[PDB]
Amino acid sequence: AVSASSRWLEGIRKWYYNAAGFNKLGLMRDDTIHENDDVKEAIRRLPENLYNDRVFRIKRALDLSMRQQILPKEQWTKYEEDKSYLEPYLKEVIRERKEREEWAKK
C-alpha cells in the first residue's frame, strides 16, 4: 500500500542513481551488468546499431578512467533516460532454459 511514498521512492532512486559515478561517465544501466551465461547469448541477439554504440561508449568510457577525468557534468547521463534494451532480450534466455531446466527434471 504505497502511493505518495511511491512518489517518495523515486527521489532516493534518482538520488541513488546519482550516487554511482557511471551516470557521470555517460554509461547506462545495462552495460554496467556483470557478465553471465544469459548475458552471453543475449549479446548475440543484439542488432549492431545498439551493439556498436554499446561498444564505443564503453571504449570511450575506459579511456577517460585512464586519465582520471570525469565527463563534464552537462553530458552526464540523465535519470529520466535509461535504456532497458538489454532485458527484453534477457527474459528470453532466462525463460527458455527454465523450461529445459524443469522439463528435464521430469
Next chain:
Amino acid sequence: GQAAGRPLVASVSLNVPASVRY
C-alpha cells in the same frame, strides 16, 4: 527418362537423412 514412379524428383527433410526421387 525417369519419372519412373511418379512425376518429378522430390525433397524431404525431417529426421532420418533425406530423400530424392525421379
Next chain:
Amino acid sequence: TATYAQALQSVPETQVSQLDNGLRVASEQSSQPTCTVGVWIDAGSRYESEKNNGAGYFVEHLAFKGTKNRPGNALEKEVESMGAHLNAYSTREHTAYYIKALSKDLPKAVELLADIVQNCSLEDSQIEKERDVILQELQENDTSMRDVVFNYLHATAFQGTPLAQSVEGPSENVRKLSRADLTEYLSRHYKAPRMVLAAAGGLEHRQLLDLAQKHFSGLTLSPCRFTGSQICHREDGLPLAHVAIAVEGPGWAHPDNVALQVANAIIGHYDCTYGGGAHLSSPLASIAATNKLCQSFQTFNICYADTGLLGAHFVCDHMSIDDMMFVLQGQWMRLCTSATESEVLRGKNLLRNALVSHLDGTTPVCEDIGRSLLTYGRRIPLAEWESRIAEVDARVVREVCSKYFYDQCPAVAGFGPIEQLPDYNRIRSGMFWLRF
C-alpha cells in the same frame, strides 16, 4: 474403429498349411486386388563349402536367364506380359524368391515360380556371361565402403566358421565354378522342408493351398566362435574413415532379443542432415550435431540363428575419431547403471511405432512370414509383441545390458584413414568403468 487396443484385435490371422514332401503353406488375407507371391529358403553360405562359397550367389542371378521348360529370356517375357514386377534376393541365412502381382493370374505365377525353383537351364552360355559380370562386379564392389567393412567385421569375429565368409565368396572360385557343383547344391538344399511358401493379398488360405497345386518341393550347422580381436585396413588417401564396433549377442529365438530392441532405439542415431539440431533428446544426436563429432552414425542389430550383433557404425573426421568413441562408451556404460524409467518410455513408444509402421504393405506383410516361419515358425504374435513390450523393465534393460556389455571383449573393424583410432588396450579398459 481404430483404437490402439482394439486396433490389435481385428487383423486377418496367420494361416498355415502343410503338404507332404515338407513344403510349408501359409497366408493372410489383406482384402487386396494384388498379391505378393514369395518363397524363402534357409540354405546359407554357412551351409556352403569352401568351393561352394559364393556359388549360390552366382546361382541367384542365373534363374532368370531361362529355365528348363522356358529357355533363355522366355521366362520374363511372360512375366512382364502381365505387368507384374518380379524380384529375387539372397542373404547369408536366407534366400527369398518372390513376385508382386495382381491376384488374377497367380495360377501361372507359382506354376511359373515352381518351375524355376528346381527345373533350371544350366547353360555355360549364360555361365560365362554371368561369370564375367560378377567378376566385373567383384572389383566394382570396392565403391560402396559400407558393405565393405562389414565383410571385415564378420570375418574378424567369426573366423573359423562358414558364417565368417564372403557372401559372393572369393573371386577365383567364381572362375573355377562349374555348374555341376551347383547341381549338387541345387539338389542339396533346395529340397523341402527347407523350402517355405507364403503370400498375402486378397488371397484366402485354402484358395492358396488348392492352387499350391501339385508340383513339388523337395525330398548341418555349428555354433560359431566369437573373437576378441581387431582388424584394420589403413588407407589414408580417402577423405573419410568408416568405423564399426560390436559385441556378439543372442540368436534369433531368445527372450532378451526384444529387451535389447529398445536400448538401441533409446540411444538412437544421428546424421548430418537432420533438422533436429542440438535440442534432440538423444545425447548422441545432441552432441554429434552440436560439435559435429561425426558425420553420421546408426546402430544395428543382427541376430543370427544362434547369434546376435549389437553395435554401431559411424563416420567422423580423421581428427575427430577418438572423441566420437569416448562419447559412445559413455552411453552404453551409463545405461548399464544409472539409467531411468522416463527415457525408457520415449524408447518404448518409438519401437511400438516402428513396429506398427513397417507392417503396412503387401510384400513386407508377405515377407515377415517367410523368415518368421524359418525363424519362429508361423508365429506372427502381433498383439503379443505389444504384450511383449509391456514386459520390459528398468532393471530388465540394466540387467540385460549388464550381461552383454559390462566388461566384455568387443570386436573392432576399421577402414582408413584410421590411424587416430586408439589401440585395443584402451578400448578394453574403456569397456568397464572404474566407476568413472
Next chain:
Amino acid sequence: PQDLEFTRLPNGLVIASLENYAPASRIGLFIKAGSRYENSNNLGTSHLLRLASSLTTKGASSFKITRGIEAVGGKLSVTSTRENMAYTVECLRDDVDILMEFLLNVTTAPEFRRWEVAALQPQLRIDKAVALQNPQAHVIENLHAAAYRNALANSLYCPDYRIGKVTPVELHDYVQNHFTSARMALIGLGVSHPVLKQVAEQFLNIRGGLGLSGAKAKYHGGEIREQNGDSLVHAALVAESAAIGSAEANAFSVLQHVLGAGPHVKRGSNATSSLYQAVAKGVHQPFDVSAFNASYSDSGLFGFYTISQAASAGDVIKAAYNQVKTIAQGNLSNPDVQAAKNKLKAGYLMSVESSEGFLDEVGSQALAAGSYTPPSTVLQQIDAVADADVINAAKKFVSGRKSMAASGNLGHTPFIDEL
C-alpha cells in the same frame, strides 16, 4: 472401415477423412506453394522455407516442440516439389490430438528470430549438396530452365549468391502471401471426420490474399550443355507434353510404357521395350535409355533421359530418336499397348495401393480437383485411350520444339542441330 469422406468448407478447404481400424493414425496437409511461386528476388525461399520446419513457433519454444514429438513417439515429415508443399505427420492412434495441435502452431504461428534464422544459413549447402550425388539430379534441374523461361525454370534449390540474401521478413511475407484457407487443404486418414471436422475450421480460417498464379511458365525451349568430368555423359530430349489431368497426359502415360522401361524383373533388360532393344541391337556395350514423362498443372514435359559412354551418346540418342520415328510413322502393336495398359493399370494400382503414397494421391487430387475418383474409374479411363492418340501423341514430341540438356565430357556430344 468407412470409405473416403471429403467435405467442402465455406473456406472451400476440403477436409477429407476416412475411418481406419489401424493403430497407425496419420494426418497430412497440402499447400499449393511451389518453386514457381518464388520471384527473382524471392529465389530459393521455399527451399529455404522447407527448412523452416523445425523452427520456433509463435505458440511454443521449438525446444519443447522437438522434445515433444520424440517422447511421444510420433514422427514429423515435410515435403515439397516444384508445385505443392506438403506437411505430413504421424503417430499412434491414440495421441494424435497433442501432435495434431502442433501441426497448426507451425503453419499457424510463425516466428523468425533474427538469431534463430542465422544458424540455418550453413545448412542449405550440405543439404543442397547431397542431392547432387545423383548426376541425373543435377541434369533435371537444369532442364526446366532450357524448356521454360519463368516458372518451372525455378530451381528447387538455392542459387548460391542467393544464400546470404534471405531475411526473416521476405520469408514472413511469402508465408502469409501464399497461405490462404482457400488454398490450404487438410487430409485425415485414420481419424473420424467429426474430430477432423471440428478443429479444421477453427484455427485454419485465415484470409485471403491468395495464390499468385501469374506464372504460366511459358514453355520456351532451347538447349544447355555443361562441360563436366563424367565418363558417362547424360542428356535428354524433350518436346513439351500436355497439362496434367488429360487423356493426352494419359496417352503419354501410355506412350511411355510403350518404350518406357522400368525394370519389372531384377537386372532384366526390358525386352518388351522396343526402345532399349531397338537400340541395344544396333548398339554396343553398356548404356541405358528410359523415357521421361512428367506433367504439372498447366502443362508438363515428355522426354527420355539417356546415359551412355563418350562416343555413343549421339547414336544412342539418334537411333532411339530414330526409333521414336518408327513409332511416329504408323507403327503400332495393340497387345503391347494392351500389355502396357495391363502394366499401367497394375503399375497404377501397385503405385496407389500404398497408403502413404495414396495419402498423397488423396490430396494430389484435392488441390487438383477437390473430389475423389475411384481408381476403377481411372482403370476405366485408362482403357479409354485410343491408339491413334498415343500415335499422334508421340508425333507431337516429334512434331514440335524440342530441348536438350547435356553434361559430362562433351567432346562428341551433338547439339539438337545434329538432330
Next chain:
Amino acid sequence: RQLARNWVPTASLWGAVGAVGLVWATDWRLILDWVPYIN
C-alpha cells in the same frame, strides 16, 4: 528427480572401503584379536 540408482549400493561399499582403510592404516581402536594379533 531424484532417482539414485545402483550408485546407492555402489557408494555403500565405498565408505566401507577406506574406513577399513584407516582401520587398515593404524587408527586407534584395537580390533578384538580375531586370528592372531600379538598380545
